[PDB]
Design a protein around this ligand. Structure first.
Ligand SMILES: [Zn+2]
Lengths: 351, 254, 157, 79
């Protein structure tokens, strides 16, 4: 009675540990099953040698009386306490409840005894409605950077496709009485909020926004949802493609440019006094309505900053309190005391 | 020939108490695999289904499939004379016209024997257990009974609304309205007192209070009760026995 | 022991909040025992909207970022005993945008989160209350409910 | 225009500039912004001057001037 789990691009199953198999029975009360296994010197060194690309993952599958149809998700009984040689395993074997297949295997590698000694994995559970089957496989790790190399070899979303999408979505607005004059697109990755290096999306994505393929593979290693971070459609690794249109913008833009404004034809322009000495700091004071941009020395106290702001508002300084990071700031304190940086915000409130 | 021996006489007493105040005529079908009993009230909306396995009896024997149509209000009177420390035993012929209830005390070494005349009850109602349900919750039967009791004195209709991992019982009446909210939890140190919830889809149903007041009477059987709710299907309230169960099929209001 | 994406995203989230956050709000990572910042646990403050009973008060919360962030949503928690129908007695809340099984997206910023917690204060959901003291008053005595909110606003001010 | 007006719909990252007549309902305006972002129109809160906008309203019903900004927020529910 073996169970075939849905494969993952981050790890490929190699060999099974026959002794590391246990069953979870249906019970309304407490339950616990253990499994003792021993590893050879070859397998122990395979898993313990430094920079080893192999691990010992603990899989779990929910038994179906109708028979396994293949590509089963990973499902552990909850609540539970997983233990490997009396070490409570705090891995994330739960994933998302509403999305089966988001649970990752448990990593037994850091808790293995030397090959001369006998290991022991214990699973405590309570109030189970289904039967679960546990397996212990040796896997080979695949890094997100290795998967990115295959994405760059895949065919790209060419500029012709994006121009057709822009022309299609424009005429659909004309039929709806709308006129799209221009669109401002962000060059930042919605996953990491860094400047995109590999702007990508699924070939089935019906939107213009892109995300970084490398950071997207990092997020799938966190939780394997395999959905677009923008439109939430299901995404296969082979259907992830680099956007030729968005990549060309990044190659012809300055690294400080976070946004670009483009028209329906494909043309785009980059969206763009702050120069100071290395002893001053750029601050931004606000009262909820107006905001003044200051530039004072990091050593000078904020007392004269509070005076210059209260004076421009025609109000006495005794009636205004100034907050930074929620905490009220004293007059004798300098931006160096409060660990301020450029473009920080100081809020002003009345009494 | 039938010979089912309940290890504890109060067990079969609690079973009959679970659906004697809503159904008057029940057709008990006995086989070698156990005892099956299903009935339905005059409203034709509440279906009582009973199953008892051979693992629940101290001893059991049923050479031929025997059907025992009984009157509950008369059978409950016989069981009323029995003691909660006795050993009930049911005996019937191969072609029986009556049943014999044998009460055997285990301590005082006493024997009391009663007899009931069988009735011929036609018709049937197969227990249509649905394939799946939107939500499935189970909680202590004593707590679910107090919820129904506290809300029945507020309206003749109780609404079960499950959303955002939260179970809210609503009762909207003429004089006033009330509500009871319970939160799911499964404590490993005491799993028998948990409120488990397996919500595949948020449900929102409504049931008659007088019907739920009859369902909670099965609390004497199991410490817990399972409630399986579906949108396009009647609800399923079940009380687990040692080898069987007593379940109710109530259709929600629309 | 922190992943590359969690650290990078948390560093960008603090960079964005430092220079552009809504007025009256504050949010900063808490300090460890050695004084260094814990980017996975923040202290924040939600000011009540003007005109509503919650006005004048700044209510503190805790934002705990899990290891799987931003694939998993962070957890927000008021002080235990906070008076609101949809707030647990322990202080936990449950917004649809902070629910991994619902409307949580990795592109949700801290600015959108603190604005979502603010909109819940003066707009409870009767379909799923999380406590009893605030649910009773909200469901059978609006006059006393506003009395506590006007008192709790003066409490956190 | 004096017959048409320009409006800006933003979510803090991406924004689109439109142009319609003051009598045109904003329902078409909202469905376009959400469809171009890969979202459903019933999952966003469009606000003007900090007030929610119905699908039946028009720019003249709320007295929208030129280059006014419409903020799009994520729809949420507590519990
Ligand atoms: Zn997409």
């Amino acid at each position: 009675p073996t169970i075939h789990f849905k494969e993952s691009p981050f790890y490929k199953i190699q060999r099974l540990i026959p002794e590391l198999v246990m069953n979870v029975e249906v019970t309304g009360g407490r339950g616990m099953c253990s499994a003792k296994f021993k590893l050879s010197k070859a397998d122990y060194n395979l898993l313990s040698n430094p920079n080893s690309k192999h691990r010992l993952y603990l899989f779990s599958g929910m038994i179906n009386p109708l028979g396994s149809r293949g590509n089963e998700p990973i499902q552990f009984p909850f609540p539970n306490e997983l233990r490997c040689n009396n070490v409570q395993i705090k891995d994330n074997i739960r994933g998302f409840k509403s999305k089966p297949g988001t649970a990752k295997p448990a990593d037994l590698t850091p808790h293995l005894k030397p090959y001369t000694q006998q290991n022991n994995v214990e699973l405590i559970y309570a109030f189970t409605t289904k039967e679960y089957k546990l397996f212990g496989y040796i896997v080979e790790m695949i890094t997100p950077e290795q998967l990115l190399e295959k994405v760059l070899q895949h065919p790209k979303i060419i500029k012709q496709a994006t121009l057709l999408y822009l022309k299609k979505t424009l005429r659909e607005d004309e039929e709806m009485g709308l006129t799209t004059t221009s669109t401002i697109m962000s060059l930042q990755d919605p996953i990491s909020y860094t400047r995109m290096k590999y702007p990508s999306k699924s070939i089935n994505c019906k939107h213009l926004q892109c995300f970084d393929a490398l950071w997207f593979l990092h997020s799938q290693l966190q939780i394997p949802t395999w959905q677009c971070p923008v439109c939430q459609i299901d995404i296969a690794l082979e259907n992830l493609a680099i956007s030729e249109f968005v990549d060309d913008i990044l190659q012809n833009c300055q690294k400080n440019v976070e946004q670009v404004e483009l028209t329906s034809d494909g043309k785009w322009t980059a969206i763009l006094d702050k120069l100071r000495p290395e002893t001053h700091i750029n601050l931004k004071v606000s009262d909820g309505s107006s905001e003044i941009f200051f530039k004072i020395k990091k050593t000078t106290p904020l007392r004269r900053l509070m005076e210059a702001f209260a004076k421009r508002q025609g109000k006495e300084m005794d009636s205004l309190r100034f907050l930074y990071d929620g905490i009220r700031i004293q007059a004798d304190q300098t931006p160096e005391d409060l660990d301020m940086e450029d473009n920080d915000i100081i809020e002003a409130h009345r009494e | 020939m039938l010979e089912a021996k309940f290890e504890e006489a109060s067990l079969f007493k609690r079973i009959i108490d679970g659906f004697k105040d809503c159904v008057q005529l029940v057709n008990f079908q006995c086989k070698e695999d156990g005892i099956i009993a299903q009935a339905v009230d005059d409203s034709r909306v509440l279906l009582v289904s009973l199953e008892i396995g051979v693992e629940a009896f101290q001893e059991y024997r049923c050479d031929h499939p025997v059907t025992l149509g009984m009157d509950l209000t008369s059978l409950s009177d016989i069981l009323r004379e029995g003691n909660n420390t006795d050993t009930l035993t049911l005996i019937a012929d191969n072609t029986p016209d009556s049943i014999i209830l044998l009460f055997e005390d285990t301590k005082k070494d006493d024997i009391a024997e009663y007899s009931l005349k069988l009735m011929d009850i036609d018709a049937d109602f197969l227990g249509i257990e649905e394939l799946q349900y939107d939500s499935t919750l189970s909680l202590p039967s004593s707590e679910f009974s107090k919820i129904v009791r506290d809300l029945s004195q507020l309206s003749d209709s109780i609404n079960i609304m499950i959303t955002c991992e939260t179970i809210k019982f609503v009762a909207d009446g003429d004089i006033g309205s009330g509500s009871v909210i319970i939160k799911p939890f499964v404590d490993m140190e005491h799993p028998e007192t948990s409120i488990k919830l397996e919500m595949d889809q948020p449900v929102d149903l409504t049931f008659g209070a007088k019907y739920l007041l009859d369902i909670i009477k099965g609390s004497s059987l199991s410490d817990r009760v399972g409630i399986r709710l579906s949108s396009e299907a009647p609800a399923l309230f079940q009380f687990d026995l040692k080898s069987g169960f007593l379940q109710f099929f109530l259709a929600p209001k629309f | 022991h922190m992943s590359s994406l969690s650290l990078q995203r948390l560093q960008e989230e603090r960079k964005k909040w430092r220079k552009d956050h809504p007025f009256g709000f504050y949010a900063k990572p808490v300090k460890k025992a050695d004084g260094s910042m814990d980017l996975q646990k923040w202290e924040a403050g939600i000011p009540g909207k003007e005109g509503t009973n919650w006005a004048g008060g700044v209510y503190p919360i805790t934002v705990e970022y899990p290891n799987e962030y931003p694939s998993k949503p962070p957890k927000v928690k008021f002080p235990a005993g906070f008076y609101h129908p949809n707030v647990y007695p322990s202080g936990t809340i449950c917004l649809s945008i902070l629910n991994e099984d619902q409307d949580w997206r990795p592109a949700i910023t801290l600015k959108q989160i603190v604005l979502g917690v603010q909109d819940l204060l003066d707009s409870p959901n009767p379909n799923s209350p999380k406590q009893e003291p605030a649910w009773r008053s909200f469901s059978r005595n609006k006059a006393e409910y506003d009395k506590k909110v006007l008192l709790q606003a003066r409490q956190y001010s | 225009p004096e017959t048409h007006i320009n409006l800006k719909v933003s979510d803090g990252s991406s924004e689109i500039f439109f142009k319609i007549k003051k009598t045109t309902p904003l329902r078409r305006l909202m469905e376009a912004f959400a469809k171009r972002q890969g979202k459903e129109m019933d999952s966003l809160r469009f606000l003007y001057d900090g007030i929610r906008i119905q699908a039946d309203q028009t720019p003249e019903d709320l007295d929208m001037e030129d280059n006014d900004i419409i903020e799009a927020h994520r729809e949420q529910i507590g519990g």
